[PDB]
């Protein structure tokens, strides 16, 4: 049986090729996770089909219905066999799906226009002239919602009631908001994404300060999957071969335009 | 029953308290992993006994005899129920024991005596005046032995044939060798340890260059263990609550001497 892989359009992980109109199947896409999926499929020896998650979300459980959405939802309800994307390994998700060891280590970071007078999370929490937010339905937002750290809790109290909303639907919208806000909007996002964008023209953004936390992305499978064990060993094998480091260079700096 | 925890005397992870002769049981030790063990036990709800691995090794399989030694061996043969130490998550180990998601991210790094004209692995590979080696019997040595990357394979070719041996029995031995080498010996070791030593008197060593690779330490249990699931969730919960970050600051920088 062909393995149904659920993923999400997020540069440089999964993107449609410039000439995708004349292409079909998995060939329509390119990126870090597209290469990784190919690598995994080869070592575990299976055929697969890349599918973009219907609702474009990573995965969160509805507090009222208790229903999981996003890529996590597709695994939980059996719509997909494996998720290969920048999906954060978290406690709540670990309880409903399985994750391989991390294929990438990262942390929450700050993105500023450039020239913006901000160097740390503390700086953001001390003023109100510069607004800041995060993505929606993701591990980053949940981080600030649960944090007990003075600075982070103070930041959340602001973002929670901020008017208008400082939360964005996609990373692309976040970066776009930073760029057109005259340095009046800062964006909190995963370090890996921050670094990628900083190397993209108009080269007008920059990551500042150290990461606020440490986490990792993992390949996810439903609980009780015959692929979980194998995929986990594949990820470790790949990291040890240097393939994962080979791939990050290829999509982050080899294609850098700054 | 009381959970038997295997660990290793590696500062600042596990160390004998100054007046350990005056104490009993778990109270004899202190350190990052001693603190982590207490927390994992509380959150999983089990009583435990800390024991230092008999042979002072991390874990490797002897080709020919096929016997596992070190902490891995204690888990494989049933001498310990869990290992809480700076134990690297690797494919070969993952094949015989279970690892929780990582509680710490790190990579192989270069330690030099201050003033040594070395800034990268490439620098070490292109010269011969300065000798270099690694801990013997661990994942660092294995990294170089198994590497297919030009620079690292070149480094391994030298190290494996160097005489006298450039390998060391313990980290303390490696650090002492760097300090008394007058800059003629560089040491390859895990970043976390390098960072620790750089903050210790006499403050004469320093970490140079970026990490050679990326990986992590995980809590290990025997395959099929009843503790596996719970311990893994505990690690994720503890990371999301900031404890892991608190602990590293406590043992690395809060007690810095430089
Ligand atoms: Zn391969
Ligand atoms: Zn609802
Ligand atoms: Zn606790």
From Swiss-Prot, chains A, B:
PTM notes: Palmitoylated. Depalmitoylated upon L-glutamate stimulation.
Tissue expression = Detected in forebrain. Detected in dendrites of neuronal cells. Expressed in the pyramidal cell layers of CA1 and CA3 and in the granule cell layer of the dentate gyrus.
Expression triggers: Down-regulated in the pyramidal cell layer of CA1 in the hippocampus by global ischemia.
Record-marked site positions (Crucial to convey clamshell closure to channel opening): 118
- Subcellular location(s) per record: Cell membrane; Postsynaptic cell membrane; Postsynaptic density membrane
Record-annotated residues binding L-glutamate? 86, 88, 93, 139-140, 190
**Could you say which residues are annotated as the site Interaction with the cone snail toxin Con-ikot-ikot?**
61, 145, 237
Subunit organization: Homotetramer or heterotetramer of pore-forming glutamate receptor subunits. Tetramers may be formed by the dimerization of dimers. May interact with MPP4. Forms a ternary complex with GRIP1 and CSPG4. Interacts with ATAD1 in an ATP-dependent manner. ATAD1-catalyzed ATP hydrolysis disrupts binding to ATAD1 and to GRIP1 and leads to AMPAR complex disassembly. Interacts with GRIP2. Interacts with GRIP1. Interacts with NSF via its C-terminus. Interacts with CACNG2, PICK1 and GRIP2. Interacts with GRIA1 and SYNDIG1. Part of a complex containing GRIA2, NSF and NAPA and/or NAPB.
Q: What is known of its domains?
A: The M4 transmembrane segment mediates tetramerization and is required for cell surface expression.
Provide the protein name.
Glutamate receptor 2
* Gene source species: Rattus norvegicus
Q: Which residues of the full protein are shown?
A: 414 to 794 of 883
């Amino acid at each position: 049986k062909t393995v149904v892989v659920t993923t999400i359009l997020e540069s440089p992980y999964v993107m449609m090729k410039k000439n995708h109109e004349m292409l079909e199947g998995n060939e329509r896409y390119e990126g870090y996770c597209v290469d990784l999926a190919a690598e995994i499929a080869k070592h575990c020896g299976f055929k697969y089909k890349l599918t973009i998650v219907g609702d474009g979300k990573y995965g969160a459980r509805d507090a009222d219905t208790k229903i999981w959405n996003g890529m996590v939802g597709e695994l939980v309800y059996g719509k997909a066999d494996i998720a290969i994307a920048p999906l954060t390994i978290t406690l709540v998700r670990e309880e409903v799906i399985d994750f391989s060891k991390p294929f990438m280590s990262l942390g929450i970071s700050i993105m500023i226009k450039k020239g913006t007078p901000i160097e740390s999370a503390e700086d953001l929490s001390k003023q109100t002239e510069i607004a800041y937010g995060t993505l929606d339905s993701g591990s980053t937002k949940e981080f600030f919602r649960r944090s007990k750290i003075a600075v982070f809790d103070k930041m959340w109290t602001y973002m929670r009631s901020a008017e208008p909303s400082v939360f964005v639907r996609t990373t692309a919208e976040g970066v776009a908001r930073v760029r057109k806000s005259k340095g009046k909007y800062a964006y909190l996002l995963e370090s890996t994404m921050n670094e990628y964008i900083e190397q993209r023209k108009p080269c007008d953004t920059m990551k500042v300060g150290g990461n606020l936390d440490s986490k990792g992305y993992g390949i996810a499978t439903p609980k009780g999957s015959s692929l979980g064990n194998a995929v986990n060993l594949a990820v470790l094998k790949l990291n040890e071969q240097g393939l994962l480091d080979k791939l990050k260079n290829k999509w982050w700096y080899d294609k850098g335009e700054c």
